[PDB]
């Protein structure tokens, strides 16, 4: 298994306190139930079936964001080695099974509020001694950290080995052919979440490949024409709803393995991710792998918010540092369409049409989110959506480098 993890709590955007409502806690983690695998209980196949369009939690990412903020107020044992209380609520037991209001006879000490708190497993010995039962905490803490480290989209990791896929993964993928991405993400989250696993397990390699294939198809390098061992993803029409993708297997020519092992960190540079299911699912799926295997290497600090500069065990600027790339969906879509034309899947006339449709589609997302922010100002004390500025929708980021990586990743 993996007997240790490191983490980092969220950042307050100038606000004095963690940004969540008691009702949010009572809603999203109440009932004295275990909160440690609930991230998918409120997700579905598509936005059309979900109440993400109005009222509280009016965004795809809203619930998970609030969850991360909520945990930041109660992860003190991995920072100070002691369970604490915040606004009259604390854990029921040293195992951190569930939350409850504080007892009246011997209350635990009140938590002193802070932000961006580094976290170590070793600070709380009882965790390792009860690793078999406290395992799910590992995944969620990792996920929270992977999101807290970045403004805009969360961070996740990619890698491709020089070897071909093992047969086990091949068989496994051949059973997930027609599945949409959202369902796939659930299984990955479900897998790594509920019991310890070794990194040398078939599922771990399987999910690792999935993240690679997803990105390769996202950049448009992997298509019906060119595939990884026969597999590739298919994206829905921008004319109706491009925020959907499913797995496919095909006769197409198989891409050759890279000359050397490739790996990098990724994130979305634009606010569109907050209301776009494929981004959320892709990130969560990829983050699941790192949860069970740990971080392969320190993340480059060069392009991260101020609070992420030089976080112990997480970020660095030395030699053993993996760069992190980022992209904007709209330029990414244009690149994907261009690759399709060069592969001959489409004509030039269609490529122009596709760009127009996707841009129109993205505009609605921007229009919806920007109106949603003023409806939920962060000064209200809870953050349903991450703050941003209008110009953030126009950043091209490192998109050119990103497609270049896929170019080198699937030769």
């Amino acid at each position: 298994a993996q007997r240790q993890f490191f983490g980092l709590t969220y950042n307050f955007y100038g606000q004095p306190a963690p940004l969540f409502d008691l009702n949010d806690l009572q809603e999203l983690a109440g009932c004295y139930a275990r909160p440690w695998t609930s991230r998918f209980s409120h997700l579905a196949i598509s936005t059309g079936s979900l109440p993400v369009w109005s009222a509280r939690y009016p965004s795809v990412a809203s619930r998970n964001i609030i969850v991360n903020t909520l945990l930041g107020a109660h992860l003190n044992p991995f920072a100070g080695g002691q369970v604490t209380s915040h606004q009259g609520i604390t854990w029921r037991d040293p195992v951190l099974s569930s939350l409850a209001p504080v007892p009246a006879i011997q209350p635990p000490p009140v938590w002193a509020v802070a932000e961006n708190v580094p976290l170590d497993s070793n600070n709380y010995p009882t965790y390792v001694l009860n690793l078999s039962s406290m395992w799910p905490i590992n995944q969620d803490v990792h996920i929270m950290t992977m999101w807290a480290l970045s403004d805009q989209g969360p961070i996740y990791h990619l890698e491709v080995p020089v070897d071909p896929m093992p047969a086990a993964t091949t068989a496994a993928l051949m059973a997930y052919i027609g599945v949409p991405i959202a369902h796939l993400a659930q299984t990955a989250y479900r897998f790594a979440g509920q019991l310890p696993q070794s990194p040398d397990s078939t599922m771990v390699s399987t999910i690792r490949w999935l993240s690679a294939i997803w990105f390769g198809s996202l950049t448009g390098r992997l298509n019906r024409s060119r595939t990884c061992n026969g597999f590739y993803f298919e994206f829905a029409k921008p004319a109706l709803n491009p925020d959907q993708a499913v797995l496919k297997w095909n006769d197409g020519a198989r891409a050759a393995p890279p000359a050397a092992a490739q790996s990098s960190y990724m994130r979305c540079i634009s606010p569109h991710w907050q209301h776009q299911i494929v981004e959320v699912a892709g990130a969560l799926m990829s983050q699941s792998v790192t949860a069970v295997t740990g971080l392969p290497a320190l993340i480059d600090e060069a392009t991260l918010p101020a609070w992420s500069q030089g976080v112990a065990n997480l970020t660095g600027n030395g030699q053993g540092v993996v760069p992190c790339l980022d992209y904007n969906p709209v330029p990414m879509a244009a690149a994907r369409h261009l690759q399709w034309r060069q592969d001959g899947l489409i004509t030039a006339a269609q490529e122009a049409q596709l760009n127009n449709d996707y841009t129109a589609y993205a505009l609605t997302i921007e229009r919806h989110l920007t109106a949603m922010l003023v409806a939920n100002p962060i000064a209200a004390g809870r953050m349903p959506i991450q703050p941003f500025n209008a110009a953030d929708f126009g950043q091209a980021g490192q998109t050119a480098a990103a497609v270049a990586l896929a170019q080198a990743m699937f030769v």
Binding site: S132, S133, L195
Partner: protein, 99 residues
């Protein structure tokens, strides 16, 4: 009994056999051990024991490779031999000889 907790309380010259019996029991009573079961992929219903594990009153070993055969170094065999040896000592004690 206090003597059973600490055999040294029993004076050898007053109760030779009982002191020996207490020492025999405290020394040769088997040692609990443990093994796993089920699959971690499916989870487990264990409450107090860590999941997918089972406790076992005797020491245990993995399944043998080639053909089996009677042996004489198992915990139970040792317990049997010492027990018999003790009672033989009892039978030859002065208490029996007089009668």
């Amino acid at each position: 009994p206090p003597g059973f907790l600490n055999p040294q309380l029993i004076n050898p010259q007053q109760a030779p056999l009982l002191r020996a019996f207490a020492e025999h029991i405290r020394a040769n009573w088997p040692q609990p051990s443990e093994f796993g079961y089920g699959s971690t992929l499916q989870g487990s219903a264990n409450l107090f024991i860590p999941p997918n594990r089972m406790v076992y009153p005797w020491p245990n070993q993995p399944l043998p490779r080639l053909t089996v055969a009677p042996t004489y170094d198992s915990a139970m065999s040792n317990w049997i031999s010492t027990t018999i040896a003790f009672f033989i000592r009892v039978v030859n004690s002065v208490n029996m000889t007089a009668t």
